[PDB]
């Protein structure tokens, strides 16, 4: 039962329990082997186990399609280290090594338990006979498609080779199919389900966006006589939630330009919020000192471009403020999400200005056209624009900010708990929008 999974989880993978109860649910569902499955969890969160552990228990071969060799290699190497009968088929292999593997799979009892293949080979006429014999001889326990989103033109990583995978899934009729990715909008999820020919009911395990402890709000810079003061007050309120620790935690302010970073750090510092600018314009030495002081809590606020990265994670970020609207909802989600990792209350705020909206909308269109002269027209170009439009919608609409985010990503309506501006005071937001409408001209 569940017992076999736990033991094989320890006896092979050396783990007491699954990272999450969701990862557990996903794995168990793949184990039952009745349903096609879709896993949309982030990088980390242990998606691989969701198909690897069940691949072992299966009494047959698991094929795994992955788009490039780096991804394949990481795991095969690690599966070997667990004394697990894994193999890779790719054209970066010698013709004889290939011939040898193909022969293995043709044998009544093949060595291979897990075969990683590229989409190219999986479609190739040179591999269909092998695949046919595995199907005929009922030796195939799972078809797995990693980076499933690559099938979608509305995705950011489209690969025509992935379109052929659908016809293939149909051929491997009996056997369950598992599709995995870190990132799919509802439109991408639809393209995956359809283009991979997943058999309904498709069982879905998707890590929710929602974070209780983050308080989201938007302010309109055009409706504010002291913007710098508004920001100061915001940073101070976010810091010093515990008079016991005095001024407690740290904060990020994001700006589009390096000039804005420099200038805004001054405005804040002068008003009594100690802030230093971080951008690629600074000398390496300067950057390492600013980062250090922020990390070591000598300087509570960093004013940064997108150059500040998930590479540095800090638990006690009490606020992220976007002085300028982000290029994309996914960017805003990622950037604002640097807040509150320790679980304690934090504040995410976006400073919206139609002058900003237009400045960015222009910048995107200009560097999309720069691509169209180089590579020509593409469906990804339209998704780039759609990605920004979602965030403009997020600002200029009224409704739970967390729900708007859940909707974009394809999550359930989340449990807001007066945890965004709109849910706390729907009226103020209405008033503020109305106000921006008068200030429209």
């Amino acid at each position, epitope marked *: 039962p569940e017992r076999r999974v736990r033991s094989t989880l320890k006896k092979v993978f050396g783990f007491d329990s699954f990272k999450t109860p969701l990862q557990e649910s996903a794995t168990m569902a793949v184990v039952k082997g009745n349903k096609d499955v879709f896993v949309c969890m982030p990088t980390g969160a242990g998606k691989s186990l969701c198909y690897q552990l069940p691949a072992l228990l299966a009494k047959g071969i698991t094929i795994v399609v992955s788009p490039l060799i780096a991804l394949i290699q990481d795991q095969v190497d690690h599966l070997l280290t667990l004394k697990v009968r894994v193999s890779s088929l790719n054209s970066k292999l010698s013709a004889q090594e290939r011939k040898e593997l193909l022969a293995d799979l043709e044998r009544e009892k093949p060595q291979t338990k897990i075969l990683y293949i590229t989409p190219e080979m999986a479609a190739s006429s040179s591999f269909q006979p092998t695949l046919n014999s595995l199907v005929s001889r009922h030796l195939l326990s799972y078809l797995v498609v990693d980076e499933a989103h690559c099938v979608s033109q509305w995705g950011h990583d489209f690969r025509p080779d992935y379109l052929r995978l659908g016809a293939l899934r149909s051929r491997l009729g009996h056997a369950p199919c598992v599709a995995l990715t870190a990132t799919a909008t509802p439109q991408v999820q639809e393209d995956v389900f359809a283009a991979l020919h997943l058999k309904k009911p498709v069982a879905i395990f998707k890590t929710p966006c929602f974070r209780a402890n983050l308080f989201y709000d938007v302010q309109f810079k055009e409706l504010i006589s002291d913007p710098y003061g508004n920001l100061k007050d915001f940073c101070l309120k976010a810091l010093g939630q515990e008079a016991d620790k005095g001024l407690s935690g740290c904060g990020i302010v994001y700006c589009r330009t390096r000039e804005a970073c420099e200038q805004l750090a001054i405005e804040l510092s002068c008003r009594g919020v100690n802030a230093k600018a971080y951008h690629a314009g600074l000398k390496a030495s300067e950057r390492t000192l600013v980062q250090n002081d922020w990390m070591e809590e000598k300087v509570p606020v960093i004013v940064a471009t997108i150059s500040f990265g998930m590479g540095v994670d800090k638990a006690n970020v009490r606020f992220v403020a976007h002085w300028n609207i982000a290029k994309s909802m996914a960017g805003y989600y990622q950037e604002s999400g640097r807040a509150g990792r320790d679980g304690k209350p934090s504040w995410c705020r976006l400073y919206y200005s139609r002058n900003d909206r237009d400045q960015v909308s222009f910048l995107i269109r200009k560097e999309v056209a720069k691509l169209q002269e180089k590579r020509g027209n593409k469906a990804s170009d339209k998704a780039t624009i759609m990605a920004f439009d979602a965030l403009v919608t997020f600002c200029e609409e009224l409704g739970c900010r967390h729900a708007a985010i859940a909707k974009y990503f394809g*999550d359930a309506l989340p449990a807001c708990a007066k945890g965004c501006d709109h849910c706390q005071n729907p009226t103020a937001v209405r008033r503020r929008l109305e106000a921006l409408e008068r200030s429209s001209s």
Partner: nanobody
Amino acid sequence: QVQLQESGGGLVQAGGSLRLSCAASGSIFSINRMGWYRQAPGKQRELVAAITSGGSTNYAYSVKGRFTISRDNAKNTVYLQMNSLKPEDTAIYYCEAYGTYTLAPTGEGEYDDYWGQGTQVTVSA
């Protein structure tokens, strides 16, 4: 899993008007297409009309101009306004919630088609 209830099917005079309302309930994030199918007795089931998320409609030739499909995306409800009914329109009418995306506040979801039990429409001349 989802609950579809069709309603508003009844015996009608020739030239009568019938409205068929089906409500989809569950943790429904979205429905690709809500559609009305009908099955006359000892005849094979046929598409009467369907409407996508986005409002693209699609109708059988014989009901074009007499029948109007419409949807309330937020209530997950589809309607079929049947006008100028004929005896040939007599059948059991089924509603198909096609591509129905379900999701808990945990990441646990499903994607499936759902069908109703059907509602009898009889048209007397």
